[PDB]
Structures are given as structure tokens and as C-alpha cells.
Amino acid sequence: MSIRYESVENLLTLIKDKKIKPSDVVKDIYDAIEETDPTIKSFLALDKENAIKKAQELDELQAKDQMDGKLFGIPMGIKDNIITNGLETTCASKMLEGFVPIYESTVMEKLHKENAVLIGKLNMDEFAMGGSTETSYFKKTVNPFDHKAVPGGSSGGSAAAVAAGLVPLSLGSDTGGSIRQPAAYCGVVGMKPTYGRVSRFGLVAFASSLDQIGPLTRNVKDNAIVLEAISGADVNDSTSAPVDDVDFTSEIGKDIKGLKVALPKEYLGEGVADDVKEAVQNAVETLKSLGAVVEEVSLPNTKFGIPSYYVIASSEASSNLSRFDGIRYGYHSKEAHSLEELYKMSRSEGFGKEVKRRIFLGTFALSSGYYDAYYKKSQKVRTLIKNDFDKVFENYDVVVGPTAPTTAFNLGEEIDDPLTMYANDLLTTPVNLAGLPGISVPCGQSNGRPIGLQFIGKPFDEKTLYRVAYQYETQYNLHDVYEKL
Amino acid sequence: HFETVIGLEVHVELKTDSKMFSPSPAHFGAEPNSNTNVIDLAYPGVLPVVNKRAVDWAMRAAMALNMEIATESKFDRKNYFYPDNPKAYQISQFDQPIGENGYIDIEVDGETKRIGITRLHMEEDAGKSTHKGEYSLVDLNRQGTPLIEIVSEPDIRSPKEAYAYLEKLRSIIQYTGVSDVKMEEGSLRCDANISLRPYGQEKFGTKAELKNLNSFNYVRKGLEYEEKRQEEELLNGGEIGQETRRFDESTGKTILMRVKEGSDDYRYFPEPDIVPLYIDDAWKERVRQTIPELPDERKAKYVNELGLPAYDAHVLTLTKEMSDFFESTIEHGADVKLTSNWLMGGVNEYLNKNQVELLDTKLTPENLAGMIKLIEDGTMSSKIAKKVFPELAAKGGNAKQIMEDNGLVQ
Amino acid sequence: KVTREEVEHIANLARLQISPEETEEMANTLESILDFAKQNDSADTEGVEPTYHVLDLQNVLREDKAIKGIPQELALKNAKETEDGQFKVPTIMNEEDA
Numbered sequence: 001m002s003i004r005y006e007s008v009e010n011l012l013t014l015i016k017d018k019k020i021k022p023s024d025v026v027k028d029i030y031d032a033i034e035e036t037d038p039t040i041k042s043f044l045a046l047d048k049e050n051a052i053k054k055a056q057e058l059d060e061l062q063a064k065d066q067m068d069g070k071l072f073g074i075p076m077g078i079k080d081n082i083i084t085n086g087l088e089t090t091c092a093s094k095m096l097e098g099f100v101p102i103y104e105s106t107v108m109e110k111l112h113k114e115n116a117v118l119i120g121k122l123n124m125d126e127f128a129m130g131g132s133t134e135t136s137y138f139k140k141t142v143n144p145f146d147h148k149a150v151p152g153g154s155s156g157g158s159a160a161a162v163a164a165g166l167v168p169l170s171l172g173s174d175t176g177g178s179i180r181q182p183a184a185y186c187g188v189v190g191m192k193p194t195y196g197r198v199s200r201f202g203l204v205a206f207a208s209s210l211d212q213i214g215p216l217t218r219n220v221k222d223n224a225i226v227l228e229a230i231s232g233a234d235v236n237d238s239t240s241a242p243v244d245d246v247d248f249t250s251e252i253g254k255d256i257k258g259l260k261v262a263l264p265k266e267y268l269g270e271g272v273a274d275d276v277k278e279a280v281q282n283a284v285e286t287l288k289s290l291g292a293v294v295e296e297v298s299l300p301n302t303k304f305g306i307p308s309y310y311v312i313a314s315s316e317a318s319s320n321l322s323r324f325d326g327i328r329y330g331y332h333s334k335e336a337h338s339l340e341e342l343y344k345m346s347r348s349e350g351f352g353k354e355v356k357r358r359i360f361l362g363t364f365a366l367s368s369g370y371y372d373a374y375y376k377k378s379q380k381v382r383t384l385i386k387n388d389f390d391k392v393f394e395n396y397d398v399v400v401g402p403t404a405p406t407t408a409f410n411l412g413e414e415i416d417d418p419l420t421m422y423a424n425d426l427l428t429t430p431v432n433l434a435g436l437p438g439i440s441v442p443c444g445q446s447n448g449r450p451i452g453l454q455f456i457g458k459p460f461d462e463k464t465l466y467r468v469a470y471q472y473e474t475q476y477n478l479h480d481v482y483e484k485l
Numbered sequence: 486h487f488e489t490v491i492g493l494e495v496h497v498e499l500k501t502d503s504k505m506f507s508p509s510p511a512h513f514g515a516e517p518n519s520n521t522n523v524i525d526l527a528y529p530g531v532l533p534v535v536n537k538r539a540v541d542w543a544m545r546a547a548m549a550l551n552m553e554i555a556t557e558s559k560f561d562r563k564n565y566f567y568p569d570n571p572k573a574y575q576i577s578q579f580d581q582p583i584g585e586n587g588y589i590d591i592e593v594d595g596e597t598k599r600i601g602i603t604r605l606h607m608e609e610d611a612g613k614s615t616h617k618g619e620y621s622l623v624d625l626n627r628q629g630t631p632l633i634e635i636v637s638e639p640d641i642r643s644p645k646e647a648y649a650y651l652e653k654l655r656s657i658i659q660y661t662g663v664s665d666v667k668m669e670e671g672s673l674r675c676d677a678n679i680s681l682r683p684y685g686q687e688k689f690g691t692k693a694e695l696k697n698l699n700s701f702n703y704v705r706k707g708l709e710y711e712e713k714r715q716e717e718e719l720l721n722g723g724e725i726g727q728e729t730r731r732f733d734e735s736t737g738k739t740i741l742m743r744v745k746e747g748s749d750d751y752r753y754f755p756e757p758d759i760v761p762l763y764i765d766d767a768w769k770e771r772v773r774q775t776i777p778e779l780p781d782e783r784k785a786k787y788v789n790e791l792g793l794p795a796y797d798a799h800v801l802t803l804t805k806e807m808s809d810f811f812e813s814t815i816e817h818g819a820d821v822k823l824t825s826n827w828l829m830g831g832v833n834e835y836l837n838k839n840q841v842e843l844l845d846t847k848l849t850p851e852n853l854a855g856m857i858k859l860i861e862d863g864t865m866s867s868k869i870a871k872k873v874f875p876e877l878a879a880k881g882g883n884a885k886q887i888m889e890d891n892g893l894v895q
Numbered sequence: 896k897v898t899r900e901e902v903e904h905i906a907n908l909a910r911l912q913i914s915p916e917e918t919e920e921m922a923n924t925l926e927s928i929l930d931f932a933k934q935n936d937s938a939d940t941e942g943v944e945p946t947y948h949v950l951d952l953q954n955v956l957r958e959d960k961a962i963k964g965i966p967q968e969l970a971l972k973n974a975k976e977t978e979d980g981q982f983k984v985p986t987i988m989n990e991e992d993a
């Protein structure tokens with residue numbers, strides 16, 4: 001626990017300066033986990049033995065003055081729907097319980113390159129579907145700020161573990177807001193980079209046209225640091241953008257005066273609760289108090305976010321999940337007599353209710369006769385949502401608004417009602433559809449539950465989001481709060 | 486009596502080094518599931534990476550068949566569960582086929598008929614499921630091998646025309662060197678479709694896919710057999726409707742193996758994981774200039790320029806390889822007709838009783854021409870010919886050499 | 896709408912097993928989701944192109960160089976039913992037609 005609360009940046013220098021030893025930092029981490037994760041339940045499969053061994057290696061290198069890497073000795077937690085060679089990757093589902101990959105994901109190859117230490121695998125909603133992690137076939141993760149409320153979804157474990165002070169950084173996947181929505185509910189900093197910014201190779205697909213790996217940290221400076229670590233073209237991902245400039249820290253610290261910010265009315269519309277609403281309006285001011293120019297704009301199609309998302313995602317999921325039939329890996333139904341059964345039963349036995357609903361609705365929307373009215377139809381609505389942004393970006397630099405409609409909710413509150421649970425992604429969905437980069441940072445609290453302020457930048461312009469987002473962080477944040485929980 | 490509207494479906498294996506979307510080898514050993522990788526195995530969270538040459542080669546064939554190469558073109562996902570299809574979705578092409586509206590001219594009783602080909606797209610072969618007793622065993626070695634489909638318009642009108650088409654198509658793709666086109670090796674496959682339309686019906690008959698055709702000869706039989714099958718059954722009650730049929734290689738018949746219920750829903754949809762291809766003009770050219778002179782163009786030359794027998798021009802241009810060797814041997818001084826007989830005769834024999842490719846042997850258009858002349862010189866009788874060739878052929882080097890590296894001259 | 900059969904057809908399309916008790920339930924849920932999905936109908940999409948890829952990239956092609964396949968060992972390492980070096984799966988075809 002001792003450094004269990006230090007920030008990546010400080011936990012780095014503190015090692016570079018040789019005050020703390022790599023194996024001790026790791027010794028600290030596990031102490032924290034073992035002492036706090038049984039209550040929080042943010043982690044899943046732990047990799048303590050291989051972590052120590054990795055620290056041990058690092059200590060030697062620490063003596064030989066050969067401490068290379070943008071994250072040397074820094075502990076890291078990964079979302080369980082991200083292939084981690086040789087661990088056990090389950091995407092939080094019966095379907096993959098025991099599944100031990102035989103390849104490494106690119107983000108993983110990369111961090112490892114940067115000498116980050118893999119402490120363990122973080123929990124999430126089974127197959128990235130859901131917004132509270134409650135679906136996790138393994139355990140229910142709670143919110144550090146209130147063990148009674150959900151930590152968000154679907155990278156719930158990813159934000160919880162970080163908010164609980166179990167690691168200085170972690171990775172999540174965002175599809176409808178699966179990285180921000182949580183980063184919000186847990187008052188932590190979460191970023192979803194521009195689609196094509198981080199390889200998807202190694203990421204257990206949900207919605208191929210939407211997914212994207214993003215980092216979660218306790219501060220805007222560390223977050224950015226980590227992104228530099230994982231962003232960048234990849235030969236194993238035809239879709240990763242061949243973009244060179246990966247320096248996201250360069251402009252952090254600079255002022256934002258003159259920075260044209262756009263406050264889309266839709267983002268403070270009906271769905272948004274009152275307390276949250278208030279909080280974001282102040283931010284606007286904490287924003288004007290700074291140099292930024294905040295003028296109201298309009299994103300008319302924002303209301304069609306959730307629906308289209310839901311369809312495009314379920315449809316795509318419908319396909320990206322068909323590969324699970326227990327023949328090459330995963331859950332294999334024993335009561336095996338025919339071939340049809342092998343498929344029908346392994347799947348119906350391995351997937352949870354929610355995951356199976358998606359596929360239903362996903363296979364229906366693509367099915368002959370309904371394709372154009374649902375899938376296609378949706379794909380178009382998506383087109384309209386990118387325009388809402390394009391236009392605006394002709395006159396602005398970034399877009400602001402609350403990250404989530406409300407403050408985190410309770411466990412079991414909206415779990416037994418499908419539709420509603422989805423209504424919380426009203427503010428993140430548009431981002432993914434436009435393939436734009438979004439970042440979340442705390443801007444206030446309510447009943448002790450954090451609220452999330454969001455910045456949606458132009459494509460590949462994350463260096464600017466971190467910029468505008470760092471200034472605000474200097475005026476408000478929960479830095480000195482996580483320590484008291 | 487009635488018309489016999491039928492078209493052919495020829496899948497072609499590209500002989501690239503790596504599979505269609507994966508960097509795995511396209512040529513595999515006997516050992517099962519030893520030529521795979523995370524991608525072919527459909528492990529979770531892997532992605533497809535389009536084989537560049539594949540596309541090159543694909544659009545090259547498309548242009549060989551005179552198709553109209555698309556400008557905008559992307560892949561789609563053909564959804565369906567089956568052991569030898571791990572992703573549960575074969576990547577292929579729905580609306581924008583890399584190739585469209587082509588044609589090849591054949592010759593039927595009397596004059597030339599032009600059969601048009603509707604499309605030609607890129608897919609990925611599936612694994613092989615060996616039926617071993619109660620259970621079946623899955624082998625993915627082959628899984629992901631690049632394929633090009635060639636859907637013929639329903640313009641071919643007989644089991645003999647069918648053969649004609651296939652014989653050309655094959656020959657042509659062959660010259661494109663993108664495949665070996667051998668049904669014996671399954672690098673050329675045909676699914677047929679036959680349906681009888683009483684002369685002057687407009688609406689086509691009712692087709693019945695004809696699986697298990699493993700050779701031109703065979704495709705014929707099945708085709709003509711099924712032609713009768715339904716002919717007569719169309720005199721009785723009968724429909725032979727939306728039905729599939731397998732071909733029994735021994736009896737020579739068509740066995741019904743299913744009956745479509747409506748239309749097989751595959752939920753076709755554009756593969757997001759693969760950015761769209763934009764085939765600029767310069768792309769089309771590069772691959773444009775890579776098409777060698779096709780058979781018909783060569784034969785004509787032979788027949789009306791080199792004063793050669795039409796039959797000869799045939800044999801001599803079945804496969805690009807020889808054809809070339811021929812054309813070179815003659816620009817080397819060798820007699821025109823003499824060259825032809827040695828390729829048809831001598832050479833081919835050698836190639837046969839050694840099952841070696843004409844280019845793996847040790848003779849060259851030059852060293853051959855050298856020997857031919859020696860005959861038209863008188864310096865070497867045809868008696869000596871049958872002796873010097875076999876050696877000069879493979880593991881040889883010069884023509885006179887064997888007359889002195891041994892002992893005979895004049 | 897959304898009739899029992901349709902639920903079974905979908906359930907049949909994707910390979911998911913569903914008995915009745917869950918089918919007349921899925922009849923409602925699907926009915927709802929879809930009622931929800933009807934929302935996009937308020938979005939004016941007359942003559943607007945469908946977005947297939949959000950990233951305007953272009954012509955990402957892999958060089959045709961083969962890379963050795965992984966050992967039969969690994970391919971199989973995560974499959975439960977295997978023999979003779981292959982994946983073992985039933986085959987008396989489709990349930991109530993085979």
C-alpha cells in the first residue's frame with residue numbers, strides 16, 4: 001500500500017531516483033489488493049508470481065543504472081477482455097473460464113516493452129456488454145466511493161481498481177462509453193482515444209467498428225503518459241491508423257485562453273439529472289474563469305446515439321461472437337449428442353442473458369428482410385451523428401458536456417430492466433459512432449458520488465483534449481480524496 | 486426436348502505464399518492443424534490482414550476474362566456455422582466484386598457463342614472436416630487459403646458447352662499464373678446448375694446445384710445425366726425444384742441431398758475490420774500489363790503467321806509454359822514444325838514419365854533449338870535424336886556434347 | 896409482432912438454444928428492444944449514405960510473405976475434445992432433420 005496511491009509520474013521518478021525498489025512497489029501493490037480487492041472486487045485473475053519475478057528482474061536493472069522504458073517498474077491492471085499471453089482471459093464469461101491465450105495483444109506487447117508490470121486482470125461486464133459490470137459471471141465489483149453503488153460499465157473493474165488505489169494505471173475498452181462512463185462513476189480519469197489510435201489486435205471484439213482500447217488513471221498527466229505507451233500503428237490491425245505523432249504530453253500544462261469550446265445543448269438536455277447538470281455548468285465557468293471561450297452549439301442527432309449504437313453494436317456483436325462454439329477453445333457442452341447441440345448448448349450454456357439478448361437483436365437486425373430497416377438504417381443515423389460533430393468542429397476546438405446523465409447508480413437498481421441501463425450511455429454513444437476521441441475527468445460530487453466532465457476532440461487531436469483537460473484538473477479534482485477512499 | 490439453361494461455378498485457389506487474410510503458409514504438410522495460427526484458429530480478438538498479391542492476382546484474372554474491374558470495393562462477411570469455418574463467417578464479397586460482367590468465347594456446333602461471366606470475387610477456403618466414424622475430425626491447415634469465385638452467367642446451353650467453358654476458363658486463368666487450375670489437386674472446383682426451360686418459356690427452369698463434380702469429364706456426365714433426369718421427369722409430374730444434388734462418381738447419377746426451404750440467410754454485411762479498397766487507375770494498369778498473350782490470340786498467330794496446323798496450335802497453347810518455350814525455341818532458329826513435334830512428341834513424353842514441369846527439366850529454348858537444327862542439318866538422324874534428347878532433356882546442357890561425351894557423329 | 900417462430904428462427908440463425916418458457920419471454924423482450932430501436936425512425940436519413948468505417952484510411956495491404964504456422968500443440972492447447980491431432984466434433988449432422 002505505501003506507494004499504493006502514488007501517481008504514475010511520481011511512482012516513476014521515485015524509482016528512477018532509487019528510493020523505492022521495483023519488487024517493493026510490487027510488494028506494495030499486492031498488499032493493497034489482498035487487503036482491499038475482496039471488498040471492491042475489481043480484479044479477476046491475478047499474476048503475482050510472474051509479477052514478482054518481473055520486479056526482481058527490474059531491481060537488477062535498477063542497480064545497473066539501466067532503467068529503460070516510459071513505465072519502468074510501474075504496476076498495471078488490464079481489462080479481462082484484452083488478451084494477456086499466458087494468463088487466463090475470460091472477458092468475464094463462463095464461455096472463456098480457463099481460456100489461456102497463446103498470443104499477445106499489441107497493447108500488451110507495447111506496455112511490456114515499456115517495462116510496466118502486469119499485476120492482474122480487471123473485471124468487466126461479460127463480453128463488454130453492460131454498464132455496471134453486474135453481469136460479470138465471476139463477481140460483482142462495487143464503487144470505491146460507495147460500496148453500495150455500481151462502478152459503471154463495461155470496464156467497471158478498470159475504473160474501480162484505480163479509484164480504490166490498487167494500481168497506478170489500467171486499460172479498458174470503450175464501445176458505447178465503456179471506459180468513460182465508468183471513469184465517471186468512479187471519479188477517475190478515463191480516455192477513449194481516436195478510433196485507429198490504439199491497435200484492436202488482441203482485443204476480444206464486441207463491435208469492431210466501435211471498440212477501442214483506452215487508459216484509466218488518477219490524473220490527466222498519467223493518463224496521457226500511458227496513452228503514449230499504447231497508441232501507434234500496428235501491422236496486425238488493418239484499421240489502426242498510420243499516424244506518427246504520438247507525443248500527447250508536449251502541450252500539457254499550457255493555457256487554453258482563446259480555446260473555442262462548444263456546449264451542445266443536447267448534452268444538458270432532459271436525460272441529464274439536475275445535480276449533474278449544475279456541476280457541469282460550473283465547470284463551464286471554471287472553464288471561462290480560465291481562458292477558454294465557451295459558446296453554445298447544437299448536436300441535434302445526439303438523441304439517436306443509444307439506439308443506433310445498440311443496433312450497430314448488437315448486429316456486429318452478433319457476428320464477432322459467433323466464433324465461440326467451444327470447438328477450439330472455451331466452454332464445451334458435455335451432454336453432446338448432435339452437432340447442432342454442440343453449438344446451441346455450448347453457447348446457451350456459456351453466454352449470460354444480456355449477452356444473448358444482444359445477439360438476438362443483433363441477428364434479427366441483420367436477418368433478411370429486416371436488414372435495411374434496422375442495421376443499414378442505423379449505419380445511416382451514425383452518418384448523421386458524425387456530421388453533428390464535423391460541422392461544429394469547423395468553428396470549435398473541442399466539445400464539452402457531462403460524461404454521464406446521472407451519478408453512479410446502485411447495484412440491483414436498474415439491473416433487472418434492459419432498456420434503462422442503456423440510457424446512461426446517452427452522452428458517450430455519439431463519440432464512438434463518430435470514431436472521435438473522448439476523455440473523462442471528475443468535475444464534482446453528489447451525495448458523495450462523483451460526476452464526470454467530458455471533452456470530445458477532433459480526430460487524433462488528443463494532445464489538445466489532455467491540454468484543456470489538464471487546466472480544469474488544476475481547478476478541481478479528487479487527487480487528495482482517493483486516499484480516504 | 487426443352488432448353489437446358491445451365492451455368493458453372495468455378496472456385497479457384499490462388500497459389501500465393503500466404504493465406505487470404507492471414508500470414509500463414511498457403512501450402513501445408515500432411516500433419517493436421519500444423520499450418521494455422523491464431524487467425525486461422527479464430528482465436529478471440531484477432532483480425533484479418535488482406536494478402537496484397539491476392540488482390541493483385543484476383544483483379545488480374547478478372548481483367549483476363551474481360552471483366553470490368555470495380556473502383557470502389559470492399560469485403561463482407563458471409564455468416565454461417567460449420568466446424569471447418571471457425572470465425573463462423575467466411576470473409577468474401579457481396580455487392581462490389583473485384584470483377585464483373587466478363588466473358589469468354591467458346592466454339593459450339595459450328596460457330597462461336599459468347600458466354601458471359603457475371604462476377605469474380607475473393608473469398609477464403611475453409612478447413613477440412615474428415616468424417617471418422619461416429620465423430621468427425623477438424624483440420625484447419627487449409628483454412629483461410631485465398632480463393633476467387635467465377636460465376637458464369639446462365640448463358641451456357643449444354644453439357645458439352647459446359648465442358649467448353651470450363652476448358653477455356655481454366656486455360657486462361659492458367660496463363661495468368663495465379664493458380665495451377667488442377668481439379669486433380671482441387672485448385673479448380675466446379676459446382677453446376679442445370680434447369681430445363683421448354684423452349685420459349687421465359688422464366689428459367691428450376692435449377693439444382695450439382696455438387697461433387699471433380700473433373701471436366703465428370704461435370705459433363707452429371708450435367709447430361711441430370712439433363713435427362715429432369716427431362717423425362719418433366720414428362721411425368723415433377724419439378725426437381727429448388728433442390729441440391731450430389732454426383733455419384735461410380736453409378737454416374739445425381740443424388741438428392743437436401744431441398745431448400747426458401748433462401749439460405751447468411752446475413753451478408755461489410756467486414757468492418759477491413760478498410761475499403763480504392764483501385765485507382767494506376768493500380769488497374771500495373772496489373773493490366775501483367776496479363777500475357779492469351780491462348781486464342783496466340784493460336785491465331787501460330788495458325789496464320791508461322792504456317793502451323795490448327796491442331797498443333799492447340800496442344801502447343803494449352804499451357805502458357807510450353808507455349809512460351811515453343812515461341813522461344815523458334816526465335817532461336819529451330820524449324821517451326823519440328824519444334825512443334827518435339828514439344829507434342831518427345832518433350833511431353835519426358836515430362837510425363839517423370840511428372841516434372843517443363844521448366845524444372847534441364848533444357849532451354851536454346852539448347853533445344855540447338856538439337857533441332859542438328860537434325861535439319863542432317864548431322865543427326867532421328868535415330869540419334871531419341872538418344873540425345875532424354876539426356877539433354879533433364880540433367881544435360883549442350884547438344885553436340887552427348888555426341889562426344891559419348892560417341893556418335895554422322 | 897415478433898412471433899414465436901421468428902424468435903426461434905433468430906435463435907436458430909445464431910446458434911443459441913432456447914426452450915419455450917424463454918421463447919415467449921424473448922418474444923416480449925425482443926418486442927421491447929425493437930420498440931426502442933424504432934427511435935431511429937425520427938432521424939431523417941433520406942439520401943444519406945450509411946457509415947461503414949469511421950476511419951477514412953485506405954488500401955492497407957499485407958505483403959505476401961508466409962510465416963510458419965504454430966505447433967499442433969498450441970492450436971489444440973485450449974480445445975477440450977481432440978484426437979489424432981484434430982478438433983473432435985459430433986457429426987450426425989443437424990438434430991431433427993439429421
Ligand SMILES: Nc1ncnc2c1ncn2[C@@H]1O[C@H](COP(=O)(O)OP(=O)(O)O)[C@@H](O)[C@H]1O
Pocket residue numbers: 490491492493494636637638639677678679680689690691692
Ligand atoms: N434456373 C437456372 N438454371 C440454370 N442455371 C441457373 C438457374 N438459376 C441460376 N443459375 C446459375 O447458377 C449459378 C448460381 O447463382 P446463385 O444461386 O444466385 O448464387 P450461388 O451459386 O452462390 O448459389 C449462377 O451462375 C446462375 O447463373
Ligand SMILES: [Mg+2]
Pocket residue numbers: 608634
Ligand atoms: Mg463461394
